Amino acid sequence: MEVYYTSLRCRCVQESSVFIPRRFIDRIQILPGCPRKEIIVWKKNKSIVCVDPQAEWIQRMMEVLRKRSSSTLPVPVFK
C-alpha cells in the first residue's frame, strides 16, 4: 500500500506499507506542526522511506527494538 498526503504540514508526503527487512535498515526516526506520527526509515543503501505507521511489520519491529534497548544492559550487582 502507498498513501499520498496533499497536506503541507508534514515532511512525509508519501508513505509506504511495504515490508523492509531489518538487515537493510540503518535507522528509524519516530516523529510524534505535523498532525500525524511519522516513521522515516533510513536504508543501508542511502535511500529514505516514510512508512505507514499502521503497517503491522513496522509495529512489530519497533516493539522488538524497544524491548532490546533494556535487554543488553550490564547485569546489576548488589551488596
Numbering used by the authors: 2 to 33, 37 to 83
Publication excerpt:
CXCL13 is the cognate chemokine agonist of CXCR5, a class A G-protein-coupled receptor (GPCR) that is essential for proper humoral immune responses. CXCL13 is an agonist of CXCR5, activating the receptor, resulting in downstream calcium signaling and ultimately the chemotactic response for which chemokines are named. As elucidated from structural data on many chemokines, this conserved tertiary structure consists of a disordered N-terminal region (6–10 amino acids, referred to here as the chemokine N-terminus), followed by a long loop known as the ‘N-loop’ ending in a short 310-helix, a three-stranded β-sheet and a C-terminal α-helix. Furthermore, we were able to utilize two of these mutants to solve the first uncomplexed crystal structures of human CXCL13. These structures allowed us to observe that the core domain of CXCL13 (i.e. everything except its N- and C-termini) is fairly rigid, whereas its N-terminus exhibits striking flexibility as well as a propensity to form both intramolecular and intermolecular β-strand interactions.
The loss of contacts at residue 1 are a likely culprit for the significantly decreased efficacy of this construct, suggesting that residue 1 plays a critical role in triggering the activation of CXCR5. We were also very intrigued to note that once again the N-terminus of Δ1L2M CXCL13 formed additional β-strand interactions, although they were different from those seen in the Met CXCL13 structure. By aligning the seven monomers found within the asymmetric unit of the Δ1L2M CXCL13 structure, we were able to observe that they are all extremely similar prior to their C-terminal ends, with only minor fluctuations found in their N-termini and in the β1–β2 loop region. All monomers exhibited density beginning at the N-terminal residue Met2, with the exception of one chain that began at Glu3. The alignments also showed that the largest observable differences between the monomers was in their C-terminal regions following the α1 helix, also known as the C-terminal extension.
